[PDB]
């Protein structure tokens, strides 16, 4: 430890500079200086180590200088105090800081190593050998604290590719701990995992990062979840597929909630009926971590009467309350109708050359009739949630849409196909048998507005639904088979409907003011319904194929 050995170490290194022209002697003096320095490594002052490293650099002794720094580092902290003080988080700042002085010198050597060899080719040159020996010392070192400080240095430089090709396990430990605190380092870890074909772990990083309290925008959190769902939908080696689908499910649920929050935040900020003093606080609370469905509903979607987003929340939350779901559909239908009606009015004023109210901006292109806009809102939710949902109870929802169409005159008086409710549900994929089942119930229970002469339209709906049904049976060539199927009950319904029609004709002929004008319409509809009943009876009286529908 004492002074003579140190002086003789410096003496050898001095003589080495004087013998640069004699390569065997230069190499021997340098090794001897290194040997003596390592003997007194625990006692070397920062200034002595610095001068020695500088002279070693001048003589191209890169690897030996680094080995000396690493030897000094361990000897001043043989208990590995800095490692434990780091794996935790104080007077052990003595052990870590003394080590870091050695580590900073190593950075110095490596910087000069690259500068002296920049623009030279990799038998290997002596420069290639010195590079190999120097980085063998660095990378084969067991000082994992040194490696942590080294990785931090590479990152501060932007030398990203050098981090990724590290074949050591210490770099995993380093990135995993700084991913919990900084968004940047978490990305390297995922880039580290995936290139090594480890997608599930990268999905776990991205997921916990999407759930973290770091500063991440909602839209960036959606990107992380979209990524994780993908990395967690394909199994990397050696993890139970029954745990893959676990992470894939979690990322999927969060992604669903996150998109509802994103659509909710986008609408609130753009809403003219929301005051600005509220919008800043809205963006502050929604553009960040993902909220609970309960909070998104009670504090935002419900208050704002965003009935479509409420229905998406009910779907995501497995909310079991058919009454609330149906009432929310009713509010969405009526809200959408009222909005579409006002845009039509303003458009019609422009077409007629009228005057708009002050400040009103009319649609520049023809806006949809109210039932078209209503249908669009229904279809948007259907394509987003699928019909396999509790927010699509056809038995309850189809009568609500049908009642809307009658009560609001969305019929041929505005140019609409009177059967648009039925075409809507059929085009969404609702099976024909279920639609006719609902329409059978509507015809038999006679609840307003499905009363009086308006039951003519209900028969029109039945005829249309059955027409499209037999056409689809003829197209497929087979009838798939208490899920309702085509049977005698359909034929009985069509027969029954004939009595409804003659009853409606009779009350029409005697209306106060003159006979109704739909006498021939009803007569033709009677013939149409009877023709459909023949087709149904022929399909049932036949033997044609009943066919397959696998799960």
Site residues (vs Na ion, CB under 5 A)? 271, 273
Asked if 210 and 174 count as a contact pair (C-beta separation under 8 A), the reply is no
Query: Nearer to Na ion by C-beta: 184 or 273?
Result: 273
In angstroms, give the least distance from the CB of 344 to Na ion.
18
Q: How far is CA 402 from CA 380, 447, 482, in A?
A: 19, 12, 24
Residues 6+ positions from 204 with CB-CB distance below 8 Å: 228, 232, 247
Our CB check for Na ion shows the closer of 58 and 303 to be 303
Q: How many CB atoms lie within 10 A of CB 271?
A: 14
Q: Are the C-beta atoms of residues 95 and 74 closer than 8 Å to each other?
A: no
Distance CA 416, CA 377 (A): 17
Residue nearest to Na ion (CB): 273
Cβ–Cβ < 8 Å for 455, 521: no
Give whichever of 301 and 438 is closer to Na ion, judged by the CB atom: 301
- Residues 61, 253: Cα–Cα separation, whole Å: 58
Is the separation of the CB atoms in 369 and 436 below 8 Å?
no
Shortest distance (Å) from residue 379 CB to Na ion = 23
Output 335 or 408, the one with its CB closest to Na ion: 335
CB of 285 to Na ion, least distance (A): 20
Closest to Na ion by CB, 275 vs 415, is 275
Shortest approach of Na ion to residue 466 CB, angstroms?
Answer: 42
Distance from C-alpha of 399 to C-alpha of 383, rounded to nearest angstrom: 20
Q: Which two tokens stand for residue 55?
A: 């002279």
Residue number, 271 or 345, with CB nearest to Na ion: 271
Do the Cβ atoms of 433 and 484 come closer than 8 Å?
A: yes
Output 273 or 475, the one with its CB closest to Na ion: 273
> Least separation, in Å, of the C-beta of 357 and Na ion?
17
Q: How many CB atoms lie within 10 A of CB 468?
A: 17
Least distance to Na ion from the beta carbon of 268, Å?
Answer: 10
Question: Whose Cβ is closer to Na ion: residue 4's or residue 270's?
Answer: 270
Cβ proximity to Na ion: between 24 and 357 the closer is: 357
* Of residues 332 and 401, the one with the C-beta less far from Na ion: 332
How far apart, in whole angstroms, are the C-alpha atoms of residue 521 and residue 33? 113
CB of 157 to Na ion, least distance (A): 52
CB burial string 429-451: b at 16+ within 10 A, e below: ebbbbbbbbbbbebbeeeeeebe
- Kindly state the smallest distance separating residue 272's Cβ from Na ion, in Å: 5
User: Nearer to Na ion by C-beta: 229 or 344?
Assistant: 344
Listed residue (209, 170, 175) closest to 189, CA to CA: 175
Pick between residue 340 and residue 493 the one whose CB is nearest to Na ion.
340
DSSP symbols for 468-488:
HHHHHHHHHSS-------SSH
Q: Residue 301 CB, nearest distance to Na ion (Å)?
A: 14
Least distance in angstroms from the C-beta of 331 to Na ion: 15
Q: How far is the CB of 326 from Na ion (least distance, A)?
A: 24
Rounded to whole angstroms, how far apart are CA atoms 232 and 203?
A: 6
Among 226, 236, 163, residue whose Cα is nearest residue 194: 236
Least separation in angstroms between residue 306's CB and Na ion is 10
Nearer to Na ion, 342 or 524 (CB): 342
Tokens of 293: 């469905």
Cα end-to-end span (Å), the chain? 80
Please report how many Cα atoms fall inside a 13 Å half-sphere around the Cα of residue 249, on the Cβ side.
6
Nearer to Na ion, 271 or 521 (CB): 271
Cα distances (angstroms) measured from residue 277 to each of 268, 274, 284, 289: 12, 9, 12, 22
Residue 202's Cβ-count burial label (10 Å; 0-12, 13-18, 19+) is buried
- Work out how close the CB of 384 gets to Na ion at its nearest, in angstroms, rounded to a whole number: 22
Minimum CB separation of residue 269 from Na ion in Å reads 12
Cβ count near 350 (within 10 Å) = 13
Cβ atoms 291, 261 nearer than 8 A: yes
CA gap 288, 256 in Å, rounded: 15
């Amino acid at each position: 430890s004492d002074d003579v050995v140190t002086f003789k170490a410096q003496e050898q290194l001095q003589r080495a500079s004087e013998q640069a022209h004699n390569s065997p002697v230069l190499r021997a003096l340098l090794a001897e200086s290194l040997r003596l320095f390592e003997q007194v490594a625990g006692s070397l002052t920062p200034a002595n180590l610095t001068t020695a490293v500088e002279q070693y650099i001048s003589l191209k002794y890169y690897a030996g200088a680094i080995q000396l720094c690493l030897t000094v580092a361990q000897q001043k902290d043989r208990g590995n105090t800095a490692l434990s003080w780091v794996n935790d988080g104080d007077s052990r700042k003595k052990a870590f800081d003394e080590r870091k002085i050695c580590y900073n010198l190593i950075h110095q050597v490596l910087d000069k190593l690259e500068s002296d060899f920049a623009g030279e080719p990799e038998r290997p040159t002596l420069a290639a050998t010195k590079r190999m020996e120097a980085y063998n010392v660095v990378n084969d070192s067991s000082d994992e604290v040194f490696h942590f400080d080294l990785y931090e240095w590479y990152i501060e430089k932007g030398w990203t590719d050098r981090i990724l090709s590290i074949d050591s396990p210490h770099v995993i430990t380093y990135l995993q701990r700084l991913a919990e605190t900084d968004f940047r380092h978490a990305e390297l870890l995922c880039r580290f995992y995936t290139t090594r074909s480890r997608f599930f772990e990268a999905a776990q990083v991205q997921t916990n990062l999407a759930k973290s309290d770091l500063n991440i925008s909602l839209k960036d959190r959606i990107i992380l979840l979209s990524r994780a769902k993908g990395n967690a939908s394909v199994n990397t080696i050696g993890i139970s597929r029954q745990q893959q689908q676990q992470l894939n499910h979690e990322a999927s649920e969060l992604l669903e909630i996150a998109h509802i929050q994103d659509d909710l935040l986008e609408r609130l900020v753009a809403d003219p009926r929301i005051p600005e003093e509220r919008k800043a606080e809205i963006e502050e609370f929604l553009d960040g971590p993902i909220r609970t469905l309960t909070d998104l509903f009670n504090d935002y979607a419900d208050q704002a009467n965003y009935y479509d987003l409420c229905l998406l929340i009910f779907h995501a939350a497995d909310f079991h309350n058919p009454r609330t779901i149906l009432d929310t559909w009713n509010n969405l239908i009526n809200q959408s109708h009222f909005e579409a009606e006002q845009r039509r009015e303003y458009w019609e004023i422009v077409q007629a050359g009228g005057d708009l109210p002050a400040g009103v901006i009319a649609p520049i292109a023809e806006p949809p009739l109210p039932y078209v806009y209503v249908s669009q809102q229904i279809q948007l939710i259907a394509h987003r949630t699928s019909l396999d949902s509790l927010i699509f109870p056809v038995n309850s929802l189809l009568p609500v849409v049908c009642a809307y169409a009658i009560n609001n005159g969305q019929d041929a008086s505005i140019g609409a196909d009177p059967c648009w409710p039925i075409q809507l549900f059929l085009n969404l994929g609702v099976p024909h048998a279920l639609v006719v089942q609902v329409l059978e119930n509507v015809l038999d229970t006679q609840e307003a507005p499905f009363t009086g002469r308006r039951r003519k339209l209900v028969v029109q709906w039945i005829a249309m639904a059955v027409d499209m049904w037999v056409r689809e049976v003829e197209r497929r060539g087979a009838m798939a088979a208490s899920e309702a199927v085509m049977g005698s009950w359909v034929s009985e319904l069509l027969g029954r409907a004939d009595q409804v029609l003659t009853q409606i004709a009779g009350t029409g002929a005697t209306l106060r003011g003159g006979a109704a004008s739909d006498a021939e319409e009803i007569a033709s509809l009677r013939r149409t319904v009877k023709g459909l009943k023949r087709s149904v009876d022929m399909l049932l009286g036949g033997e044609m194929a009943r066919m397959s529908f696998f799960r």
